[PDB]
Amino acid sequence: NFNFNGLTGTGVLTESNKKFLPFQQFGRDIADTTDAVRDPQTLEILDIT
Amino acid sequence: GKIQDSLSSTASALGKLQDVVNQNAQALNTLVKQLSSNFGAISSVLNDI
């Protein structure tokens, strides 16, 4: 389980190839299936499988 | 050789199979996207309520 700064869900957290910019706090591939969070501490991008 | 020609250049004649996957696929996407709807709730996502 995970709770982030407003958005939340449950799954496994692993590495990623997708890249961000200075503004993102969220990530989904298609049709509100949230899958990508760059973490708010290390500022390091992750995937949600 | 015409049969090899007509299906290696034109993509229109394969539309009959192409519809069946597409008529399948449109129903899948509209199945998921209904979770974005409130149905008169205060939020469409379940975990907030």
Token couple for B46: 């379940």
CA dihedral for A7, A13, A18, A22, sign (positive or negative): positive
Calpha distance A1→A12 (Å, rounded): 8
Calpha distance B6→B12 (Å, rounded): 10
Tell me whether residues B32 and A31 touch, CB distance under 8 A.
Answer: yes
Question: Which method, experimentally, gave rise to this model?
Answer: cryo-EM
Contact yes or no for A40/A33 (Cβ under 8 A): no
Q: Which residues in chain B have Cβ-Cβ distances shorter than 8 Å to A9?
A: 47
Calpha distance B46→A26 (Å, rounded): 18
Q: Which residues in chain A have Cβ-Cβ distances shorter than 8 Å to B29?
A: 30-31
Calpha distance A30→A43 (Å, rounded): 23
Q: Which residues in chain A have Cβ-Cβ distances shorter than 8 Å to B35?
A: 32
Tell me whether residues A32 and B29 touch, CB distance under 8 A.
Answer: no
Name the one residue in this structure whose structure tokens are 């298609």.
A30
Name the CA radius of gyration of chain B, rounded.
20
